Structure formats: C-alpha cells, structure tokens
Design a protein around this ligand. Structure first.
Ligand SMILES: [Ca+2]
Ligand SMILES: [Ca+2]
Ligand SMILES: [Ca+2]
Ligand SMILES: [Ca+2]
Ligand SMILES: [Ca+2]
Ligand SMILES: [Ca+2]
Ligand code: NA
Lengths: 208, 208
C-alpha cells in the first residue's frame, strides 16, 4: 500500500538472520532510496528489500532514524520520503562497575536508623529502564559482627548505607571504632538468570 | 513480520495492566490460535491480541511454554506454530518456614566450642538464587542467660548451632541442666527491609 511511517524493533548483539521489510513499488515508482542514520548497517535493495548487514549496538546508537523514498524510472521521488524508525532493543551485554574499589566513610554514634551517611554507586551501560541496567545492591559481609547482629543496611535500589536499629543502639567508638562492609551489585534487578555482578569494600569509622 | 519464537519476562503477583503482544495476520493468515501452558491465564483474540488476565505465580509455574499459530480462513496453519516463552520473575511473596516448630538436642559438658551439634533448617518457596529465598539464621534469645554471656552460637548461613568459648567453659548439668534457644530465620539475606521471618524453639540438655 502507500509508503508511510513505520517503526521496527530489533535486538542488538545479534548478527542478522531475517530481513526487516520488503517494500513493494506502487507504479509509477520502480525503485527505493534509503537515507539517514544508516551507519553502513541498514541497506535497501533497488526493489525495496530493507535489511541490516551486522549486529546492532544499543550502546552506540539506541534509535536509527532512517527515511525511505520511492522513485520513478527517471529517478524522481513519487512517494515519501517517510521516516522509518529502528528501535534497538537492549540485551544485557554490559557488567555493572562500582565507581570506587574502596570507600572511606564515617558515622556518628546514635545516627538514626535508616538515615543514609554514605552512597556506594555502580554504573551499567545497559538500559536502566530494562532489567539489563537495573542494579541491586547488597551487603555480602560486615566485619566485625557480634552474635549475627547487622549494624548496617543498604537501600538495594539506591546504594544508600545507613545504620540498622541495632547499629544505632550499639555502635560506640570506645568498643569498636571501625567496620568493614563488602558490598555486591548485580544487574537484572537482582534476578538470577543472565546477571553480572561487582563488589567493593567500605571502611566506616564510628565517631562521637 | 513472520511468526518467530519470542520470550517475554513478566513479574508474578501483579494484576495485568498491559497486553503482551499484538500479532498481525499476514495474508493468507486471518486468525491466531494459542496453545500450551495457558493455565486459565493466557488468551489470544482471533485478531492477534495476546494477553494475561490474572496475576502470575512463579511458585505454581516459573515458565509458561506457549505456542502461537496463524490460521487461514479455512483453519489451515499457514505460519508456525512457534514457541512463545513467558519467564515469570520472582517477588518475595513466601515467608521462610522452619521444618520443625520444636527441636530437641543435647550437648556434652566440656564439648569443644564452634563444633556443630544441631542443625535447624528452614525452606523458602521463592527463588533461592535471589534475596527472596536467601536465608539468615539468628539466636533471638537464650534462656537461662548468665551475666549477658551467650553460651550458644549459630552460623547465619547453615543453621549450625555450636557452643561459644564461654559455653564450653561454663556448661555444667549440676548448675543449669537445660537451655532453650529461640531461633529466627529471615529471607532477603536477613535485612529488615522487605523480609519475612519464622521462629523455632530449640531445647538443649547438658549431658555428663
Ligand atoms: Ca551493546
Ligand atoms: Ca548490565
Ligand atoms: Ca545492552
Ligand atoms: Ca508467588
Ligand atoms: Ca521468601
Ligand atoms: Ca515468589
Ligand atoms: Na544486649
């Protein structure tokens, strides 16, 4: 039918195994012209076969804005150009990376439970609107630890470290002036399958 | 385009708010048929509208293996069937449960510290490779307790109960012949936020 705007969604990181679309020339159109963000990847054959020639990369270009025009036997545009939008669908091909391998923090004796005093942070180049770039932070270990009582907690979404109820009650620089936490981060929103992880080390001084 | 295998990942425990996918019939296809693990949940409209009509439950079915076929006006399959995979993403919707509500054990006086003599165990129906099913064991209280000294300890990952150094030094059937421990188990790795818990009771006789 008439040439019109179209959107195609194509996963990145996959070498092409299927065409995108076969356009059919409406006489007096005989050939097609593809322009825009083709990047030596998107091709239209003379008689309308639109395809891609190699794996896409959302982290290089997340949308290819293309245009297609239909031309007559004299090379005159008779339909379009119209916008053809390629949405590059994300895969989990980037690992989360803590921005420091060691954090130095401090907390006041009697800091209110749940009040952040330190943020750890990781970046993930995947799409944060998808599981692939959605990070989940956790405390792997606290040292020292007495009778399995955690004195620290982390906001699993934000990386905010705060005292627990019991940490607020028990932390005392006279008894134990420093704690080490090992923190993990994983992508896939903390789900198991196809996830990547990183760790960092946090030393926390307890002050008056 | 042509029917091909597709995977969708959907969280359990949420009322559906969006369709899954609209299949568009390419002539001579006119309608679609859905088969497989539909479970009075997954439906396709003739026209192509694939949706789910009630919350999923990973603990009932963790992957729905569906198939979609395109039928012509005479009900001949002209495309597919192709596998449509629904991966059900886990939420923390199950409380961990101890396998016994009461444990009875014993420990010999002058037993070595840190050597397990009793395992408590809980199970959690959520995914154990996620925080939702990741368990953390603690002693809530030991009675009797002498001068604020713990005589017992528990491994927070394994549920292994052993004597402390002080317990090994002080246990004596003539002075205190029995102890009770209340043990907790928590999921989310033991953090307070978004976690569920159970408790059990452990009676321990001190022997000669
Ligand atoms: Ca990529
Ligand atoms: Ca990632
Ligand atoms: Ca990616
Ligand atoms: Ca469930
Ligand atoms: Ca659980
Ligand atoms: Ca669950
Ligand atoms: Na205490």
């Amino acid at each position: 039918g008439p040439l019109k705007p179209m959107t195609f969604s194509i996963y990145e990181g996959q070498e092409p195994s299927q065409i995108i679309f076969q356009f059919k020339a409406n006489p007096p159109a005989v050939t097609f012209e593809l322009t825009g963000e083709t990047d030596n990847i998107f091709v239209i054959e003379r008689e309308g076969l639109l395809y891609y020639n190699r794996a896409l990369d959302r982290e290089t270009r997340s949308t290819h804005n293309l245009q297609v025009a239909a031309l007559d036997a004299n090379g005159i545009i008779v339909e379009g150009p119209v916008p053809i939008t390629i949405k590059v669908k994300d895969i989990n091909d980037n690992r989360p990376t803590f921005l420091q391998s060691k954090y130095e923090g401090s907390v006041r004796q009697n800091s209110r439970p749940g009040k952040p005093f330190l943020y750890v942070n990781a970046t993930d180049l995947d799409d944060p609107a998808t599981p692939n770039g959605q990070l989940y932070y956790q405390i792997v270990i606290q040292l020292p630890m007495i009778n399995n009582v955690m004195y620290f907690q982390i906001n699993n979404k934000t990386g905010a470290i705060s005292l627990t109820r019991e940490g607020s009650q028990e932390l005392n620089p006279a008894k134990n002036p420093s704690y080490n936490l090992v923190i993990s981060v994983k992508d896939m929103g903390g789900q198991s399958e196809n996830s990547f992880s990183d760790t960092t080390s946090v030393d926390i001084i307890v002050t008056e």
